[PDB]
Amino acid sequence: APGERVVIGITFGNSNSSIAHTVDDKAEVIANEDGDRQIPTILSYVDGDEYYGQQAKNFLVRNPKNTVAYFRDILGQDFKSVDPTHNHASAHPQEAGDNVVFTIKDKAEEDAEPSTLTVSEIATRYLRRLVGAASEYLGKKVTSAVITIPTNFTEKQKAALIAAAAAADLEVLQLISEPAAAVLAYDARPEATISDKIIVVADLGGSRSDVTVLASRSGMYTILATVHDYEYHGIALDKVLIDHFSKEFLKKNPGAKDPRENPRSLAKLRLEAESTKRALSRSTNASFSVESLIDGLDFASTINRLRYETIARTVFEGFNRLVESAVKKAGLDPLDVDEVIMSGGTSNTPRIAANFRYIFPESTRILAPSTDPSALNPSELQARGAALQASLIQEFETEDIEQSTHAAVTTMPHVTNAIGVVSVSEKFVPIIAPETAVPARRTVHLDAPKEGGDVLVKVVEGSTHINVREKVWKIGSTLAEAAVRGVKKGAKVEVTINVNTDLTVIVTAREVGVRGTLS
Amino acid sequence: ATVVSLPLPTLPEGWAAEKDFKAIGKLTQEGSSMRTLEPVGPHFLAHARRVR
Ligand SMILES: Nc1ncnc2c1ncn2[C@@H]1O[C@H](COP(=O)(O)OP(=O)(O)OP(=O)(O)O)[C@@H](O)[C@H]1O
Ligand SMILES: [Mg+2]
């Protein structure tokens, strides 16, 4: 029921998940029983006990065949589309009928048959734990939620996620894209200022990386382009550390076996490599040790951030090419970008933020902890945006939310070129930015001539052009010509442009009046 | 409302129009494009409120 919902925001990723709500119109991410706000998307069974999050992640070494992980993208997919690469070190996804299933021992008896569970059943059991942790912290039973999803989630996947949540007694109010949630996490803050920006969201995750280019006008977001990558990500960063310390192990212990060839040894290396990686985001030096790595041999070593950034340079340049690809895919140039929001756990790496600063001009704001004082934790953005969206629609009826998402509401004409006025001195001033969804209205204050008097307001079209690099405006077709009589010396002339759904342009130029309409 | 430190053109001598306005051009369907918004944020809900 709309009046009695207990809503939260949920981020549901392949590697980690997070839950959030709003207190006094501010999003706050909830920690679960383990104290984790980034809760591993892992399920594991030992002696009939169900474990999730970090406790389940710890069983990846001792209990791999009864642990299920990296299953978020498997939901709602045919088996022929499943990539089992990241599941190889745990329960394998297999084909049973027209469903993807995992075979695990979730019963208590030692001579009990292992259960065969669909991926939808695994998701349901995991979502019960996530919601269960949110309900325990809130003191109330969580009933509804907004969940973020990638922009290439198929409709079949959307249904499976909603059906899985329903089986967990959780009502899904709305599914929103992961990039739009990251933008909302910033825009919905009290100190935020709404203004026209071209925004690049760099979501650097564990098993995937997604970069999205959005046009943000009038507090509303339109996705211009998106790129996906499954090669450059945090797991690839774990690998450069795994390879680095294993070669040190083999040099320190000649004749010993390679720990990457033993599945138990490799599992220990993954947990420690990720832990060393995160420490290099908080400090310039991090330790790496595994008690009894292989053949009873211990190993302990160190690495500084400088050495890490050198051996991981190939992965870092993969992140750069991803961002350049998305900007190019939108027909834009780095000079066209206003904000770069860095999202996902891997976006905590200080060097990646410094690299993006070199890609974009200094006028571009890099929203990362090490490059901006007002930045948020990159791992909390998606959960914060989902909680902010959930609090906005928690009183809506289910019918109202569905209609608000139909094509008749979301689709509307976007003005291709800019609409502005010509400035002359003895230059094009943009008023309506390019790719502005209509209806829209903007207003600028310009300087009057040296003494003023009669002044010409010439409304024209505008386009951006890059000159070798520098971004300039190019004046195109002329739209209207208006006049303001007897303007004061040193006064400012206010020029307003209004575009309707009809594409009609209404022009106003009153100094603090003349009005005109272009059908 | 954005303040810009740029001067407007002085009106040439002998220029006039009905109510000091002259319509020269207009927007075309070629000059626009149908794009899809993200159904997120209070400003979208306000837009969806007006459309319904
Ligand atoms: N402080 C940190 N510094 C560097 N990397 C980190 C940090 N914290 C987390 N990570 C990395 O971020 C990755 C997980 O990021 P995130 O939680 O956004 O992924 P996800 O979306 O849950 O998973 P996937 O990307 O597979 O869907 C992991 O590889 C982890 O090692
Ligand atoms: Mg993610």
Query: How do beta strands A453-467 and A440-447 pair?
Result: unpaired
Whether residue A24 is found in the same domain as residue A130: yes
Distance CA A372, CA A350 (A): 12
Closest residue (by CA) to atom 8 of ligand 1? A345
Whether residue A297 is found in the same domain as residue A169: no
Q: Do A176 and B38 touch (CB under 8 A)?
A: yes
Give the CATH number for residue A473.
2.60.34.10
A178 CA from centroid of ligand 2 (Å)? 7
Q: What is the crossing angle of helices B42-51 and A381-393, to 10°? A: 40
Give the CATH number for residue A282.
3.90.640.10
Beta carbons of A72 and A42 less than 8 angstroms apart: no
Beta carbons of A359 and A336 less than 8 angstroms apart: no
Nearest to A44 by CA among A61, A57, A32: A57
Beta carbons of A333 and A323 less than 8 angstroms apart: no
Beta carbons of A385 and A404 less than 8 angstroms apart: no
Residue A61, domain member (yes or no) = yes
Q: 10 Å Cβ neighbour count for B13?
A: 6
Question: Which distant-in-sequence residues (6+ apart) come within 8 Å of A380 by Cβ?
Answer: A18, A20, A29, A37, A185
Number of structural domains found in chain A: 4
Q: What is the crossing angle of helices A263-282 and A234-252, to 10°? A: 110
List of chain B residues whose C-beta atoms are within 8 Å of the C-beta of residue A478: 24-25
Question: And the tokens for A87?
Answer: 């599941």
Q: Give the structural domain span for A446.
A: 414-518
Whether residue A242 is found in the same domain as residue A280: yes
| Resolution number, Å | 2.5
Nearest to A378 by CA among A227, A206, A144, A231: A206
Beta carbons of B50 and A412 less than 8 angstroms apart: no
Question: And the tokens for A466?
Answer: 């890059």
**Closest-lying ligand to the alpha carbon of A379?**
1
Distance CA B2, CA B5 (A): 10
Q: Do B10 and A411 touch (CB under 8 A)?
A: no
- Own/partner contacts of A374-377, CB < 8 Å, gap of 24 or more, are A374/A191, A376/A185, A376/A186, A377/A348
Whether residue A226 is found in the same domain as residue A334: yes
Residue A243, domain member (yes or no) = yes
> Ligand 1 pocket, A11 CB below 6 A?
no
* Dihedral sign from CA coordinates of A185, A186, A190, A194: negative
Residue A25, domain member (yes or no) = yes
Identify the domain boundary among A268, A292, A311. A311
Whether residue A266 is found in the same domain as residue A288: yes
Q: Do A516 and B5 touch (CB under 8 A)?
A: no
Residue A378, domain member (yes or no) = no
| Cα–chain center distance at A475 | 36
Largest CA distance in chain A: 96
Atom of ligand 1 nearest to the CA of A205: 25
Beta carbons of A280 and A308 less than 8 angstroms apart: yes
Q: Do A414 and B34 touch (CB under 8 A)?
A: yes
* Dihedral sign from CA coordinates of A131, A132, A135, A136: negative
Query: How do beta strands B2-7 and A440-447 pair?
Result: parallel
* Dihedral sign from CA coordinates of A353, A359, A361, A365: negative
> Ligand 1 pocket, A345 CB below 6 A?
yes
Residue A187, domain member (yes or no) = no
Whether residue A130 is found in the same domain as residue A204: no
Whether residue A286 is found in the same domain as residue A140: no
Nearest to A440 by CA among A499, A495, A494: A499
List of chain A residues whose C-beta atoms are within 8 Å of the C-beta of residue B11: 453-456, 483
Instruction: Please give the full DSSP string across A239-273, using - where no structure is assigned.
Output: HHHHHHHHHHHHHHSTTPPPGGGSHHHHHHHHHHH
Please state, in angstroms and as integers, the Cα–Cα distance from residue A243 to each residue in A164, A238, A247, following that order: 38, 9, 6
| Cα–chain center distance at A86 | 21
Distance CA A27, CA A384 (A): 5
Q: Do B7 and A393 touch (CB under 8 A)?
A: no
Q: Which of A442, A477, A481 has its CB closest to that of B22?
A: A481
Distance CA A254, CA A239 (A): 22
Q: Which of B20, B31, B38 has its CB closest to that of A221?
A: B38
How far does B33 lie from chain A, in Å, by closest CA? 5
Beta carbons of A48 and A247 less than 8 angstroms apart: no
Nearest to A27 by CA among A401, A389, A393, A394: A389
| Cα–chain center distance at A186 | 12
Least CA distance to B51: which residue of chain A?
A: A409
Q: Where are the beta strands (DSSP E) in B1-52?
A: 2-7, 21-23, 32-36
Nearest to A363 by CA among A337, A332, A341, A330: A337
Beta carbons of A268 and A261 less than 8 angstroms apart: no
Instruction: Please give the full DSSP string across A387-402, using - where no structure is assigned.
Output: HHHHHHHTTS-HHHHH
Whether residue A269 is found in the same domain as residue A205: no
| Cα–chain center distance at A435 | 22
Entry field: residues in chain A: 519
Residue A27, domain member (yes or no) = yes
Distance CA A174, CA A249 (A): 50
Distance CA A54, CA A36 (A): 8
Helix (H) or strand (E) holding A185, with range, is: helix A178-187
Beta carbons of A161 and A76 less than 8 angstroms apart: yes
Whether residue A366 is found in the same domain as residue A450: no
| Residue reference for tokens 């088996």 | A79
Whether residue A11 is found in the same domain as residue A124: yes
Q: What is the crossing angle of helices A381-393 and A178-187, to 10°? A: 80
Helix (H) or strand (E) holding A351, with range, is: helix A350-359
Query: How do beta strands A492-499 and A26-30 pair?
Result: unpaired
Q: 10 Å Cβ neighbour count for A255?
A: 6
Q: What amino acid is encoded at B8 in this protein?
A: L
| Residue reference for tokens 């009609």 | A504
Whether residue A243 is found in the same domain as residue A272: yes
Question: And the tokens for A11?
Answer: 């981020």
CB burial of A432-445 (b: ≥16 within 10 Å; e: otherwise) equals bbbbbbbbbbbebb
Count of A–B CB contacts within 8 Å? 207
Q: Do A437 and B27 touch (CB under 8 A)?
A: no
**How far separated are the first and last CA of chain B, in Å rounded?**
29
Residue A188, domain member (yes or no) = no
Beta carbons of A212 and A326 less than 8 angstroms apart: yes
Entry field: residues in chain B: 52
List of chain B residues whose C-beta atoms are within 8 Å of the C-beta of residue A507: 21
Q: 10 Å Cβ neighbour count for B26?
A: 15
Nearest to A345 by CA among A46, A2, A17: A17
Whether residue A362 is found in the same domain as residue A306: no
What does DSSP assign to residue A375? -
Question: Exposed, middle or buried: residue A490 (CB in 10 Å: 0-12, 13-18, 19+)?
Answer: exposed
How far does A196 lie from chain B, in Å, by closest CA? 11
Closest residue (by CA) to atom 3 of ligand 1? A278
List of chain B residues whose C-beta atoms are within 8 Å of the C-beta of residue A488: none
The technique by which this structure was obtained is X-ray
Least CA distance to B48: which residue of chain A?
A: A404
Distance CA A142, CA A390 (A): 12
Nearest to A129 by CA among A256, A20, A17: A17
Question: Which distant-in-sequence residues (6+ apart) come within 8 Å of A411 by Cβ?
Answer: B34, B35, B36, B37
Nearest to A176 by CA among B37, B36, B46, B39: B39
Q: Do B37 and A222 touch (CB under 8 A)?
A: yes
Nearest to A14 by CA among A237, A387, A323, A345: A345
Q: Which of B2, B11, B28 has its CB closest to that of A454?
A: B11
Nearest to A391 by CA among A181, A177, A218: A181
A149 CA from centroid of ligand 2 (Å)? 8
Instruction: Please give the full DSSP string across A269-304, using - where no structure is assigned.
Output: HHHHHHHHHHHHHH-SEEEEEEEEEETTEEEEEEEE
How far does B46 lie from chain A, in Å, by closest CA? 10
Give the CATH number for residue A98.
3.30.420.40
Query: How do beta strands A144-149 and A39-40 pair?
Result: unpaired
Beta carbons of B3 and A493 less than 8 angstroms apart: no
Residue A184, domain member (yes or no) = no
**How far separated are the first and last CA of chain A, in Å rounded?**
46
Query: How do beta strands A418-422 and A453-467 pair?
Result: antiparallel
